[PDB]
Amino acid sequence: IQKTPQIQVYSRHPPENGKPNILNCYVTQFHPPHIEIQMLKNGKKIPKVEMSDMSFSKDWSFYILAHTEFTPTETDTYACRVKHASMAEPKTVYWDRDM
Amino acid sequence: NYTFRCLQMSSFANRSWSRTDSVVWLGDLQTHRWSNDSATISFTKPWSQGKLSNQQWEKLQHMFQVYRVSFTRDIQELVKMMDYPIEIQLSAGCEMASESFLHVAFQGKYVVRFWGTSWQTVPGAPSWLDLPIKVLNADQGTSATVQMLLNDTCPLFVRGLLEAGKSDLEKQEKPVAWLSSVPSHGHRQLVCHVSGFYPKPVWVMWMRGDQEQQGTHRGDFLPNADETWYLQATLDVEAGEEAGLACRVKHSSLGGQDIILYW
Numbered sequence: 001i002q003k004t005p006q007i008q009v010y011s012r013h014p015p016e017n018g019k020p021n022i023l024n025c026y027v028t029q030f031h032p033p034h035i036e037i038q039m040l041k042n043g044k045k046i047p048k049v050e051m052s053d054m055s056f057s058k059d060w061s062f063y064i065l066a067h068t069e070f071t072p073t074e075t076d077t078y079a080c081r082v083k084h085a086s087m088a089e090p091k092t093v094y095w096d097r098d099m
Numbered sequence: 100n101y102t103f104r105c106l107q108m109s110s111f112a113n114r115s116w117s118r119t120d121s122v123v124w125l126g127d128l129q130t131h132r133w134s135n136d137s138a139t140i141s142f143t144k145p146w147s148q149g150k151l152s153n154q155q156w157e158k159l160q161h162m163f164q165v166y167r168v169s170f171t172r173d174i175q176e177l178v179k180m181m182d183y184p185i186e187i188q189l190s191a192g193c194e195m196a197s198e199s200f201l202h203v204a205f206q207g208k209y210v211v212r213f214w215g216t217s218w219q220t221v222p223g224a225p226s227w228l229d230l231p232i233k234v235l236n237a238d239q240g241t242s243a244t245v246q247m248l249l250n251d252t253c254p255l256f257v258r259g260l261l262e263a264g265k266s267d268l269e270k271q272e273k274p275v276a277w278l279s280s281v282p283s284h285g286h287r288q289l290v291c292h293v294s295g296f297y298p299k300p301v302w303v304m305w306m307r308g309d310q311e312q313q314g315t316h317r318g319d320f321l322p323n324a325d326e327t328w329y330l331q332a333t334l335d336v337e338a339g340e341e342a343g344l345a346c347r348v349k350h351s352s353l354g355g356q357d358i359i360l361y362w
């Protein structure tokens with residue numbers, strides 16, 4: 001059966017404006033394994049996104065970690081956008097340093 | 100004691116397109132990857148060959164190379180002998196005395212295991228699997244090989260991985276924590292973020308003095324890309340009542356000096 005991806009976005013280090021950091025997008029609980037993941041800066045696709053090898057959990061659902069270098073500022077937004085056969089519309093989750 | 104898992108994922112889209120990719124884990128550390136694009140299994144640690152000689156490793160790898168081709172052909176012929184797309188997953192390995200496992204899922208549901216000396220369908224598995232499992236069970240060569248892998252090779256290999264990978268397996272990395280908050284009217288959700296720790300066991304609690312706040316809501320463990328962990332723990336609080344709250348973090352890497360951040 002099809003399972004919808006969960007998406008969590010979080011920084012590697014405490015966010016400090018103007019300091020290089022790494023932004024993580026962890027995508028879990030999906031089936032089938034095929035998936036497209038984009039990371040976005042101010043709504044534009046970020047070109048250098050690295051991704052772990054996909055694997056799966058004990059419940060058989062798949063997961064993968066995407067990550068990118070970023071330098072947070074007061075005004076830049078960042079998001080992770082995922083396309084998966086389980087939903088007609090891509091799903092977007094924004095980084096929110098306060099959450 | 101650890102758990103060793105070989106995780107195979109195979110996707111068949113039609114008669115003309117399929118792929119098989121595997122990853123291998125010892126505890127939470129990835130030790131191998133085997134991409135569909137690669138003829139050979141890739142080490143993701145310096146110590147991924149464990150204590151196997153080059154000859155023992157090459158023998159074991161050849162076995163898998165033959166298996167990968169045969170598995171793909173066999174599944175495609177099963178489908179022809181009978182609905183695409185098809186997803187098949189295999190989870191095989193051992194835990195510790197040691198006990199081994201080989202579980203198979205079809206379309207994301209557990210349907211078959213190897214147990215003792217034969218393949219079995221699990222109760223509730225679709226009845227069309229019974230005949231092909233029968234025919235698979237008639238292959239004594241395969242049965243015998245699987246028995247040797249599960250009973251002998253898996254724990255042997257794991258013992259060597261544990262020895263060779265000692266410094267990584269027993270590495271300690273320190274958490275760094277930070278606090279933030281969001282509205283949740285008057286109420287706010289406080290967030291204690293904890294990142295970069297290894298190994299996984301950690302204790303994170305909101306506190307008022309020496310009193311643990313049982314509203315502490317711990318999230319899931321989320322991986323960082325550098326083989327450390329991230330966790331956050333939240334606390335709903337009434338307006339003004341934020342004063343006096345602290346997040347306390349205990350971790351093996353800290354040598355008994357907890358992190359305490361004050362709101």
Ligand SMILES: CCCCCC/C=C\CCCCCCCCCC(=O)O[C@H](COC(=O)CCCCCCCCCCCCCCC)CO[C@H]1O[C@H](CO)[C@@H](O)[C@H](O)[C@H]1O
Binds near residue numbers: 166201205252
């Ligand atoms: C990283 C190293 C660590 C080592 C630790 C070991 C840990 C685990 C062990 C993994 C064991 C994996 C099995 C490997 C076997 C190698 C031997 C071999 O060589 O295996 C192959 C292939 O077997 C299989 O196909 C295995 C099937 C397993 C999956 C069946 C589950 C049921 C499927 C349900 C879904 C159905 C979908 C249908 C859609 C309509 C045997 O087959 C070949 O080799 C034979 C010679 O022995 C030949 O006679 C035969 O003709 C040839 O085909």
Ligand SMILES: *[C@@H]1O[C@H](CO)[C@@H](O[C@@H]2O[C@H](CO)[C@@H](O)[C@H](O)[C@H]2NC(C)=O)[C@H](O)[C@H]1NC(C)=O
Binds near residue numbers: 214215216247
């Ligand atoms: C691998 O280990 C299993 C035990 O987990 C052995 O399976 C047993 O086999 C005997 C005789 O072969 C049976 O009477 C038992 O019922 C089996 N146990 C189970 C749970 O089915 C197997 O023989 C071992 N194989 C090798 C080659 O060592």
Ligand SMILES: *[C@@H]1O[C@H](CO)[C@@H](O)[C@H](O)[C@H]1NC(C)=O
Binds near residue numbers: 115116
């Ligand atoms: C088979 O699957 C692949 C991958 O999805 C696709 O490109 C191709 O169009 C499919 N159909 C046929 C008839 O090959």
Ligand SMILES: *[C@@H]1O[C@H](CO)[C@@H](O)[C@H](O)[C@H]1NC(C)=O
Binds near residue numbers: 118119
């Ligand atoms: C996977 O590898 C097999 C073996 O080389 C190859 O035939 C097949 O085209 C590959 N599948 C994809 C999707 O690249």
